[PDB]
């Protein structure tokens, strides 16, 4: 009656396709070796716990948000603060930078993902529109176009927004638990969202349905990022491990964990080549993982509190990190 | 200097932004952050004044910012840490609700749910050294109902009189027993709605006592 037999068939089909793990294939790949990551720029000015930051397409501009009620855009090269946008709700949980750099989004414990226009002829940054369609805290708001933005909310459903109209173009209600993160594909045709139910679902922007689901993690998923090729993504969860999933192989490929780590992951990112996986941790440090061999290629120390967010430049020059200590540091 | 004409102006703008951020942070620091949980929450807010709700009130030179969660039914474990460092936690419970079952085929009692929530918040790792201001509301209805429905229905092991004072004392003792870290933090328990202005007085007194105790602990005198 209640789809008893359907559950086992998918599991059997997925298991039947397992022939060789990623680790076995990458045996002949030479180790990357330790990377001498050193902070080149230290960004100060935030006086509270920063929760999210995002790089711009130019690989020089990034935006950060903090519980102090301020949304700051940084000039990475010179560390010059580009804008200081006061958030009307000081509970921000996420922020984003538009691909063109014209607009920036933020979301907090309120159910509104505000859109800010950075290129106003008025000069002053103003809230272009307020997207009040959610019933829970917003976990991730990400731009696909200057007019389309996809949002993640604690209400367990994502929403595609037509910004000019201000109404949800599409709703993604397949998740049963709170969705904590959202990552767009390189082509922006589909996106993946992680949720506290220890599962990740593949969402199609145009049609709006769950093409596939992944359940490797044993705890709440906190972050997900798309592999540069666009056919794979990495997950981050409180399970203290990161897992790699392929959209076409339908099965988990590899995991990133060590016995010395017993705390959850806050954020995950990839380099241009995809060989390096930049993952934040609650132990006030970020560990760089060999994406093809799961070996810890480096550690980014220097944070006095939990690392909340991190990201890699589009040009692949430097990786920014954010921590509850209110300091953002650029690593190269 | 290596900087160009525009770079110097950009640096000037950056340091102006730094000054503005520092000023705003200093302004925000001099303000009391109160977390409210709970049950008479709306009545208490009315007497003392779809996401989290902010309420601002001032009482004799001290400014309070109250953050009502606003019925955030999402995972509280994922955003409770956002309130780490609040001066005190306000908890509201309705005494008269010892009979309600919160539907769900009578699998729970609202008093039991309130006790469980209070225990979870008090034992929360992010509030190890955070005081709790416990408010017992709807005392009139509780007194009216106990005279016709004994509280033993809510506490089968309770063997005592159904008079208002004794039942209230037993409920207060039960709520305070949940504190497994009694030494680190104190629970300021009050029975409200005597008059509308007493709740703010109790909140102010509790905040003042918490601040004084923290100052003493910093110096090692407490």
């Amino acid at each position, epitope marked *: 009656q209640e789809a008893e037999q359907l559950k086992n068939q998918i599991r059997d089909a997925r298991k039947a396709c397992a022939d060789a793990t990623l680790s076995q294939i990458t045996n002949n790949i030479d180790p990357v070796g330790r990377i001498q990551m050193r902070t080149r720029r230290t960004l100060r000015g935030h006086l509270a716990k920063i929760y999210a930051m995002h790089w711009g397409t*130019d690989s020089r501009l990034l935006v950060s948000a903090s519980q102090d009620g301020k949304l700051i855009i940084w000039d990475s090269y010179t560390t010059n603060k*580009v804008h200081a946008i006061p958030l009307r709700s000081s509970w921000v949980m996420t922020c984003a930078y538009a691909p063109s750099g014209n607009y920036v989004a933020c979301g907090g414990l309120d159910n509104i993902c505000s859109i800010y226009n950075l290129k106003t002829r008025e000069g002053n940054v103003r809230v272009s529109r307020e997207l009040a369609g959610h019933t829970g805290y917003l976990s991730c708001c990400r731009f696909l176009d200057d007019n389309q933005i996809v949002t993640s909310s604690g209400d367990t459903t994502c929403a595609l927004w037509d910004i000019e109209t201000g109404q949800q173009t599409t709703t993604f209600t397949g998740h049963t638990g709170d969705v904590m993160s959202l990552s767009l594909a390189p082509d922006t045709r589909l996106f993946v969202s992680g949720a506290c139910d220890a599962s990740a679902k593949l969402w199609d922007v145009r049609e709006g349905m769950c093409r596939q689901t992944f359940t490797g993690h044993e705890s709440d998923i906190n972050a997900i990022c798309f592999f540069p090729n666009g056919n794979a993504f990495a997950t981050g969860s409180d399970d203290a491990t990161c897992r790699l999933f392929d959209l076409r192989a339908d099965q988990e490929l590899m995991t990133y964990s060590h016995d010395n780590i017993i705390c959850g992951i806050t954020s995950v990112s990839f380099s241009k080549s995809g060989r390096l996986l930049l993952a934040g941790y609650d132990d006030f440090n970020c560990n760089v993982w060999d994406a093809l061999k799961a070996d810890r290629a480096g550690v980014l120390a220097g944070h006095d509190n939990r690392v909340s967010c991190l990201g890699v430049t589009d040009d692949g020059m430097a990786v920014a990190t954010g921590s509850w200590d209110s300091f953002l540091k650029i690593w190269n | 200097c290596t900087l*160009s*004409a525009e770079d110097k102006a950009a640096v000037e703008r950056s340091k102006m932004i730094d000054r503005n951020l520092r000023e705003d942070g200093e302004k925000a620091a001099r303000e009391v952050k109160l977390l409210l949980l709970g049950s008479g929450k709306n009545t208490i807010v009315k007497q003392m004044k779809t996401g989290i709700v902010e309420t601002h009130f001032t009482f004799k030179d001290l400014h309070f910012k109250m953050f009502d969660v606003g019925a955030q039914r999402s995972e509280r474990k994922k955003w409770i840490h956002c309130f780490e460092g609040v001066t005190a936690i306000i908890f509201c419970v309705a005494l008269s609700d010892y009979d309600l079952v919160l539907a769900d085929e009578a699998e729970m009692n609202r008093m039991h749910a309130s006790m469980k929530l209070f225990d979870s918040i008090c034992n929360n790792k992010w509030f190890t050294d955070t005081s709790i201001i416990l408010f017992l509301n709807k005392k009139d209805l509780f007194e009216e109902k106990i005279k016709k429905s004994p509280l033993t229905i809510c506490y089968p092991e309770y063997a005592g009189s159904n008079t208002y004072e004794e039942a209230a004392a037993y409920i207060q003792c039960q709520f305070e027993d949940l504190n497994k870290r009694k030494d680190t933090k104190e629970i300021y328990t009050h029975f409200t709605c005597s008059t509308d202005t007493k709740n703010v007085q109790f909140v102010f007194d509790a905040v003042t006592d918490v601040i004084i105790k923290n100052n003493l602990k910093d110096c090692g005198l407490f």
Partner: single-chain antibody
Amino acid sequence: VQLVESGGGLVQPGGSRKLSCSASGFAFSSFGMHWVRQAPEKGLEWVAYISSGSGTIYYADTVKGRFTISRDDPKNTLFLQMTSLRSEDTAMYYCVRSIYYYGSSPFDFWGQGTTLTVSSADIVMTQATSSVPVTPGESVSISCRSSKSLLHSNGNTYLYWFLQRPGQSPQLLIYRMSNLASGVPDRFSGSGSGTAFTLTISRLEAEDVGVYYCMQHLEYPLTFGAGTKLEL
């Protein structure tokens, strides 16, 4: 966004007057303001610069001292006090907004302008042709030269192109030698070497008639070129 100058008039020899310029529709406090003078039948010329917050103030060698610049952020207005005005000071002054950050477009908006009549390692910008007779529909290329290389060590080239149509304030076309200013057709293009630059127009329209001016922003002692006056 609007800027409105005021205070124009006729001044006796050695007289003193103050020009004013109010700002509306944009965050005046966050934008640096410049004063650009233009003697009649002559090119533009930078006068003074006051940064946001009044922290940084710059003056031209020929105006420093007797000309002072101040801003009133609460009232959103700009001032330029003048003393010991010389006959050479006969010119019309234009106020220009500017906000400095990566990706910005300095000098993207210009004020109405006000008329005023009376009675050293600086980079010199020269334009090859003062006037170029052309016809509509034909691509027009305007070249300019700089005495000092404008390519800075940071990788940016600080070249600006402005168009001043008859009876209109200057309008920005190119501000970093590669970037097209907002509110302008895509026809305009900018390219050049480390010292040599040109403004190529894909196709000429009726409204493109005017005088084209160039500037270097590598160092603040800005210098204007002769100006290329297109005619049909």
